[PDB]
Amino acid sequence: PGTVQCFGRKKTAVAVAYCKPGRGLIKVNGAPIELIRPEMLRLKAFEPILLAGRSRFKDIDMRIRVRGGGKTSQIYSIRQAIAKSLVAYYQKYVDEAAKKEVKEIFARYDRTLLVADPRRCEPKKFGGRGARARFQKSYR
């Protein structure tokens, strides 16, 4: 009865990973994750995958989809949604205690894999272009 659909979120980039209990497929938008294309930030999207190992993926297919945001925002949503779909799937279908090792490895590496970042772009105030800047001021 395995079926999860778990997400992750960044500035505006929202990423949703829906899973089957297949064998080894992990794609992004139909394209393999092996090709994610900030091609220096191709380590980041793999970080959950390499922290856990494929052995924790030999029974799942992740057709993860990402919409909105920017570019690095999307990388940072994919990381989050892979991590959060993994922990949701283990917690509901492997075991709570067996999921504990996964969360403690991830939160050991960092905490931002699993928990979204509350930071957003804050509105710009009249009297100067900039959220916190102002026009240059002249006295004479």
Partner 1 sequence: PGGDVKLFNRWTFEDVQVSDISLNDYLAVTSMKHYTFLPHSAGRYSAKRFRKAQCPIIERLTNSLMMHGRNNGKKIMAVRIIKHTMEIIHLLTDANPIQIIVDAIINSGPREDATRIGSAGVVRRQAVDISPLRRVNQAIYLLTTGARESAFRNVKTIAECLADELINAAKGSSNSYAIKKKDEIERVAKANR
Partner 2 sequence: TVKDVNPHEFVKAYSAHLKRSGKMELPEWVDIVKTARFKELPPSDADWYYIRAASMARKIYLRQGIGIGGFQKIYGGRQRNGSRPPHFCKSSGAVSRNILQELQKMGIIDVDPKGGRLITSQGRRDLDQVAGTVP
Partner RNA sequence: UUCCGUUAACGAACGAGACCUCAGCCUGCUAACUAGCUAUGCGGAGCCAUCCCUCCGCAGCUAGCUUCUUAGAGGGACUAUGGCCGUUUAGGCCACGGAAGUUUGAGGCAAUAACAGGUCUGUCAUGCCCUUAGAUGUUCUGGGCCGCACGCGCGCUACACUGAUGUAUUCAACGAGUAUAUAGCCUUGGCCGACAGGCCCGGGUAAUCUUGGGAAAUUUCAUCGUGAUGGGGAUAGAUCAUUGCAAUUGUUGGUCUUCAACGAGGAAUGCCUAGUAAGCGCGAGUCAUCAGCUCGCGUUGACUACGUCCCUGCCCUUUGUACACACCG
Summarize as ranges the residues that interact with RNA (CB under 7 A).
3, 5-7, 9, 11-14, 16, 18, 20, 22, 25, 27, 29-30, 37-40, 61, 63, 65, 67-74, 84, 88, 115-138, 140
| CA proximity to 98, closest of 116, 107, 86 | 86
The residue behind tokens 């856990």 is 52
For residues 74 and 94, what is the distance between their CA atoms, to the nearest angstrom?
Answer: 28
The interface partner of residue 121, options being partner 2, RNA, partner 1, none and the CB cut-off 5 to 8 Å by kind, is: RNA
Give which of RNA, partner 2, partner 1, none residue 70 binds (C-beta under 5 to 8 Å, depending on kind): RNA
- Environment class of 98 (CB within 10 Å of its CB; exposed 0-12, middle 13-18, buried 19+): exposed
* 130 belongs to the binding site for partner 2 (CB under 8 A): no
| Distances from the Cα of 35 to the Cα of 24, 85, 91, 138, angstroms | 16, 20, 29, 52
> Could you tell me the smallest distance in angstroms from the CB atom of residue 124 to partner 1?
17
Say which entry of RNA, partner 2, partner 1, none residue 44 contacts (CB below 5 to 8 A, set by partner kind).
Answer: partner 1
